[PDB]
Design a protein around this ligand. Structure first.
Ligand SMILES: CSC[C@@H]1C[C@@H]1C(=O)N1CCC[C@H](C(N)=O)C1
Ligand SMILES: [Zn+2]
Length: 140
């Protein structure tokens, strides 16, 4: 579990969004596993606006932050699960690391700010849904 809080926005994995998120919806994209809802109070996370390929992510299943190298956001095949059929997920970045069910929502950060959140796992890999292209998160 986990979310990004920027301005009056809450960014969460679409497959983990609560009833309250759907009742206060801003934007969602199933192909990216992202959902953004509106918040009453201002958030303080800064979104990275960069092309960094090294950062640090939080892994709840180990209670540890790990330094990782990760790929550029790409269309990657993700195996069928209880939340989606087998499909290509867009804007996804992979790293070698631990990720189990329960780790989605962990933040990946570089020197510029938040890069994205854990969205996939297994086979000794961890996948992060990028948010650096969502420039509107910084305004209105
Ligand atoms: C971090 S949960 C890891 C277990 C292996 C499972 C995994 O990768 N997915 C299950 C949850 C939905 C994900 C998606 N974004 O399509 C895919
Ligand atoms: Zn960066």
């Amino acid at each position: 579990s986990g979310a990004i809080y920027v301005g009056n926005y809450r960014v969460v994995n679409r497959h983990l969004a609560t009833h309250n998120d759907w009742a206060n919806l801003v934007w969602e994209d199933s192909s990216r596993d992202l959902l953004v809802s509106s918040t009453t109070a201002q958030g303080c996370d800064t979104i990275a606006r960069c092309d960094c390929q090294t950062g640090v992510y939080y892994c709840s299943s180990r209670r540890k932050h790990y330094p990782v190298s990760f790929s550029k956001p790409s269309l990657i095949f993700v195996e069928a699960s209880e939340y989606y059929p087998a499909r290509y997920q867009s804007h996804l970045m992979l790293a070698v690391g631990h990720s189990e069910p329960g780790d989605c929502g962990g933040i990946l950060r570089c020197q510029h700010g938040v890069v994205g959140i854990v969205s996939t796992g297994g086979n000794g890999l961890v996948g992060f849904a990028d948010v650096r292209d969502l420039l509107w998160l910084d305004e209105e």
